[PDB]
Amino acid sequence: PQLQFKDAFWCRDFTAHTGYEVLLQRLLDGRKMCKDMEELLRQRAQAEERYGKELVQIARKAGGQTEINSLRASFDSLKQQMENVGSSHIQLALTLREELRSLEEFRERQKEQRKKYEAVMDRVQKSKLSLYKKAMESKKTYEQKCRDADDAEQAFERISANGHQKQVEKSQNKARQCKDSATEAERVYRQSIAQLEKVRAEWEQEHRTTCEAFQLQEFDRLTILRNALWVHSNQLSMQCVKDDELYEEVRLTLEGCSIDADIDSFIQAKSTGTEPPAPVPYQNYYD
Amino acid sequence: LQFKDAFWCRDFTAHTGYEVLLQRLLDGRKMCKDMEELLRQRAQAEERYGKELVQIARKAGGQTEINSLRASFDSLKQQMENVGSSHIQLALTLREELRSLEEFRERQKEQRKKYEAVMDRVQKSKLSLYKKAMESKKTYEQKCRDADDAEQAFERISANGHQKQVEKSQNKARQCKDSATEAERVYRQSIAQLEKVRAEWEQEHRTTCEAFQLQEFDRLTILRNALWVHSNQLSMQCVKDDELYEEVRLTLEGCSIDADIDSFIQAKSTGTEPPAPVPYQNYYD
Amino acid sequence: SKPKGPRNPPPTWN
């Protein structure tokens, strides 16, 4: 049996709402965790864009013009794939920032709903605590009136033995006046318990719904943040496959690089002559 | 076909075949330098990228999270520093390859300068003796022309002239003929000395060409290997990163949403029973 | 999913 929020965050203290305060603090801790995940993506995207842009500049500004044939094509193949890798990491930064934007939208979505429950809970809890203070004030008054009624009845019983008719009439109207005061204090006390009980069940119902809603928010936040870590690790691991495939293109170009072919291609293109100069002989002026 | 067989000049005073090969070595030296600059700038970029990844991992937050999701987020920061540290090590590996290429480059330049000194020596002597031999030819021809003019002058007056005036003109013709004969010997010896250096140069040119072909074969081999090694080291970095990111996925597989919620409840629960309702308390009961 | 990685040079080299 999976334990729920609504069943494990109550307080035996009637005037305490610690169970709600603990859950509300957990949502604030999760909100900061969502921001920390967003902060890592933003800084990683900035680093990836800067790294990609630097690779593009190195490839475009690099030399190699003096080389010819295979070695030139191989070196140009490395510069071409370097720009492709750098441009891919620039696109990775845009992908990470899209994950950054999605989390901030989800984060602000939960805050909008959380504020609604906060207003509802703060209302019913304030009314519950207010009526509780009223009920206890009614109880203290009700109990004091009962003591006054018993004291007024004991005073009547005391003087109704050998006392005069004038002093007895005064004491009997005092006992009836105090007995009526105790009856009205009981009705006010009974009505205070009735109003307090009404709000109590309302609060218990409202607290039970808020707990299930906060559990739904936490379940969604934990799921999306777990998915964000899995997607982020996949997008970085996918970048390793894309880069490795691009660097393989350089090796494919190098397979067509023959040392003997480049030397023969340079000879056939820059050869000046296949015969050494003829020796200078003696030239007779008359022969 | 080889360098020694395809870089001659029929022009005796021209050494273009040697100049073309020497220019090819200078172009190959710049190609080696351009490969060094690519490694130097890539290593600088990797060190900057690696150091930045480490700073992001160390400065990142996540303290408010607990249980699996915290361990997963801490696993991402841990592997991020490992990736950044690995890219820092990649820069040292690239710079070591950079140092190897510049060392190889200066080895060839030292040997190339030696052959340049030898060729510049024998070529300067070959051109020097050729210029001397042609100066000897011009003198020899001028002496022959002077000798023919002195003999034709004798033939002119040797018809009805006196014995004294004929002897005077014939002694001039013999004086000019002797000058042409000794000028011919100087011209002959100039051809002998020139031929000596010529054969010396042809052998020296053949040795220098064969050496330059070996240097290009070595340079093309090391640069071809340097490109293959560079592509492997970059591809190896992709494998190391994927293995590190794999550690994050393995941690995420042990991340259960329901486990984190139940673990939070068992640690922060305040009570399992709602407060008791406040009842009416009779003063007499 | 997983990178191919480095590869030995052609065996006809060197």
Numbering used by the authors:
A (entry chain B): 3 to 289
B (entry chain A): 5 to 289
C (entry chain C): 793 to 806
Can you list sentences taken from the study reporting this PDB entry?
To visualize directly the PSTPIP1/LYP interaction we produced crystals of the F-BAR domain of PSTPIP1 in complex with a peptide of the CTH of LYP, residues 787–807. An additional continuous electron density, adjacent to PSTPIP1, was assigned to residues 793–806 of LYP. LYP buries ~ 625 Ǻ2 (2.1%) of the surface area of the PSTPIP1 dimer and establishes distinct contacts with each of the PSTPIP1 protomers; hereafter we refer to them as A and B. The LYP-binding site is characterized by three hydrophobic pockets aligned on the surface of PSTPIP1. D246 of protomer B also forms hydrogen bonds (H-bond) with the backbone amide groups of K796 and G797 of LYP. The side chain of the adjacent R799 makes ionic contacts with E250 and E257 of the protomer B; in addition, the main-chain amide and carbonyl of R799 make H-bonds with the side chain of N236 of protomer A. The C-terminal part of LYP (801–805) interacts with a deeper pocket formed between R228 and W232 of protomer A. P801 and P802 adopt a poly-proline II helix conformation; the ring of P801 contacts W232 in parallel. Thus, only one molecule of LYP can bind to the PSTPIP1 dimer at any time. Finally, the conformation of the PSTPIP1 residues involved in LYP binding is very similar in the free and bound structures.
It presents two structural domains in its sequence, an N-terminal Fer/CIP4 homology-Bin/Amphiphysin/Rvs (F-BAR) domain and a C-terminal SH3 domain, connected by a linker region. The F-BAR domain of PSTPIP1 binds to the PEST subfamily of protein tyrosine phosphatases (PTPs): PTPN12, also known as PTP-PEST, PTPN18, and the lymphoid phosphatase (LYP), encoded by the gene PTPN22. Positively charged residues on the concave surface of F-BAR domains interact with the polar heads of the phospholipids in the cellular membrane.
